[PDB]
Amino acid sequence: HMSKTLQRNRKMAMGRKKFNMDPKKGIQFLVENELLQNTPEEIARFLYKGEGLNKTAIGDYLGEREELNLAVLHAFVDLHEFTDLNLVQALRQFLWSFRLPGEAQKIDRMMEAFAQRYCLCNPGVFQSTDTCYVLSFAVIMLNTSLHNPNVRDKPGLERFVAMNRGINEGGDLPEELLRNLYDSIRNEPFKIPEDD
Numbered sequence: 001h002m003s004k005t006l007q008r009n010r011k012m013a014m015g016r017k018k019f020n021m022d023p024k025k026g027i028q029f030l031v032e033n034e035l036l037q038n039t040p041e042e043i044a045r046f047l048y049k050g051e052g053l054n055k056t057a058i059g060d061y062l063g064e065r066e067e068l069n070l071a072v073l074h075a076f077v078d079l080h081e082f083t084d085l086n087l088v089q090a091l092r093q094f095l096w097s098f099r100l101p102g103e104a105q106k107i108d109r110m111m112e113a114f115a116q117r118y119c120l121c122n123p124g125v126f127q128s129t130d131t132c133y134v135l136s137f138a139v140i141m142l143n144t145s146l147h148n149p150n151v152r153d154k155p156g157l158e159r160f161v162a163m164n165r166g167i168n169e170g171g172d173l174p175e176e177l178l179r180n181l182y183d184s185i186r187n188e189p190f191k192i193p194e195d196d
């Protein structure tokens, strides 16, 4: 009843603080105190809700190499609903849900999982998941090029189109697809979580 519930609520709050200090210790405390079930899906749902969790700490946890963390990463990406979204719309959602700069192997795992999910959700768009992966990074790079004033550039649509030749199973992506992505980034930069 009430005392048990009040204690649990505070211990949940403490668990979130512990998570932000060190994700593994945070999850351990929650699991050991029966505040979170120790399944990949339940941990993923906990991270997806992200209540009081630092997005850098979420990315940290999702980027760990061990089996359970890989499984949580898979389940976390599965919670994302990309059906009928274009690649940029999907990226906006995905990239807002966690942060993880300059960890190449970790980002590779995360973006491959994203690519697989996007293509599964939208089987008509990219016949090859490699196409999706490469184009995803092209969009991220385009965002930086167009909106970071440190970057000289401002590549035009025609350059963006040229940079992506031949990645559609040896063919090209429809120019209208590329234009739509380019224009979407041009008109609205990615909202990127700040360093928490």
Ligand SMILES: Cc1cc(O)cc(C)c1NS(=O)(=O)c1ccccc1
Binding pocket: 095, 098, 099, 100, 101, 102, 107, 111, 140, 144, 192
């Ligand atoms: C998407 C992004 C773009 C940026 O310009 C900066 C940051 C920190 C992020 N987020 S990021 O975690 O560094 C990242 C995620 C996925 C792919 C590449 C990078």
